Design an enzyme around this catalytic site. Sequence first.
Site, PDB file in Angstrom:
ATOM      1  N   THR B   1      38.911  35.561  37.627  1.00 35.10           N
ATOM      2  CA  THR B   1      38.636  34.688  38.776  1.00 35.10           C
ATOM      3  C   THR B   1      37.553  33.707  38.399  1.00 35.10           C
ATOM      4  OG1 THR B   1      39.194  36.547  40.220  1.00 35.10           O
ATOM      5  CG2 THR B   1      37.952  34.670  41.224  1.00 35.10           C
ATOM      6  N   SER B  73      39.774  39.683  47.738  1.00 36.70           N
ATOM      7  CA  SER B  73      38.359  39.696  48.080  1.00 36.70           C
ATOM      8  C   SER B  73      37.730  38.316  47.927  1.00 36.70           C
ATOM      9  CB  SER B  73      37.620  40.699  47.192  1.00 36.70           C
ATOM     10  OG  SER B  73      38.157  42.009  47.362  1.00 36.70           O
ATOM     11  N   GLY B  94      36.349  40.198  41.804  1.00 32.97           N
ATOM     12  CA  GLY B  94      37.209  41.190  42.426  1.00 32.97           C
ATOM     13  C   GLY B  94      36.566  41.749  43.677  1.00 32.97           C
TER      14      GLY B  94
END
Lengths: 338, 194
Positions: B1, B73, B94
């Site tokens: 991410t 999330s 995460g």
Amino acid sequence: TLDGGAVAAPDQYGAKVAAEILKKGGNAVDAAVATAFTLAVTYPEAGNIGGGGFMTLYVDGKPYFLDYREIAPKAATKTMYLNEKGEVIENLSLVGAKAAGVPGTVMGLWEAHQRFGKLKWSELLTPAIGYAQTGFKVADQQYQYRQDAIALFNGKTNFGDYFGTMKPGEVFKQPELAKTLERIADKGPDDFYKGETAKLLIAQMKQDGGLITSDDLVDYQAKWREPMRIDWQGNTLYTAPLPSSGGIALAQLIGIKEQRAADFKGVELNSAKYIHLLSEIEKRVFADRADYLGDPQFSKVPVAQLTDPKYIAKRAGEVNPDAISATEKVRPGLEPHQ
Amino acid sequence: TTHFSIVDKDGNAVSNTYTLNWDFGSGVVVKGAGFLLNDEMDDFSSKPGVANAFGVVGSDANAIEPGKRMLSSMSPSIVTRDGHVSLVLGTPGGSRIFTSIFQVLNNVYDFHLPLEKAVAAQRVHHQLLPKDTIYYDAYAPLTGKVADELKAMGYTLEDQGWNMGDIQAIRVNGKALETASDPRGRGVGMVVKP
């Protein structure tokens, strides 16, 4: 009318591109689109056109939220990662083509720009195309992550074919990706979901036993949603609603912490008491997260009930400031009981 | 991410988190096109009560169904005050993303730290399961008195083996702007004159 604009980006290339777009007269959305395509070249461990994400916006005094999260392929099934004994198959949901959701990023960036952008779509892809054609310098963390990825993937995917040559400090070029981005600049998302790129993605699925089909790509839509709004101390936080858990989590974290203000007074940041208190709040957040949250069009998620002040006050009472609460006894907060 | 934050000279803001999920996603490159595919499917619950790669669990609401978005999330955020952008922030990580944002918000709004210190500060994480386990990173590991105290309470402390987020933030103070890039990562921030 501020003193200027600003960017905070996860590498030097995203920051440079955002700054240039702002200086050239693009707005924050123009800059975001250009940055997101740049990082799909320079930050391949996470920046992407083959994944998905979320954008929270504030434009002309109004909040917006764009959901370009991946969707399960139409052939996906509840038990697809379980073997004949009902056990999870190691790494089947993490490594290889069956681990992939339908990508949303190209459609999400398109929708954001269609709605708010001031510059031409093709302008916003030129920087990323350039970094793909002529290269960028590999970062230390990148080399370390790649070293780990070679081990996990090899010899199960074609990762090494394309990223085996990454070496820190060396210029890494991506000619096929440059052509892909040129097609996206020229054709728009139709290339990715209907055109040459779609056909290549489908070919890759067919080769690797993946599930994504032409129908999956053509049916993909990004979704504008109302952002989660959280008011505290005269501020208003806008953040991700479902299918993110973070907005509900932040509503509960902030709300509960404010309810327990008396327990936080005089406690220093990252003292044991501070960390214990945060953990006690987080116990409850994750109990609700696991039981209630998911795609809001696939179940009736009780969003309002989980964020109502009376509920937050109830959950706040459960926090134990002096000892760890019995993990076994922390329950989803809306659960009926005797 | 990964995450990035942008404010323009008109006060408009974008906070954008996007991802392949794990580093390099599924490891599958689309031959002839050159990009990686995500391994986002692991954010669904594969089996009730069985933890995914981040240790989080689910049951019906986040079970795999065709056409369904898997629970995330990611929490790209914009704070406003009196109708004007005041803070833009987000992070990867995460299941640690929104606890990390929470900590940064506490650091700014309750401990009144300068933005750079608010982002650089040690961050830790707990998520019910694994039971009584607090995660830290090697950038700012739990140590000394605080770690002994937490262990004495019955917490298990573990180095999760990757840094606890990568916050990228912009703060607006009247007409002035400042940026902060997490020292855990290689981010860069810039203010651009109009």
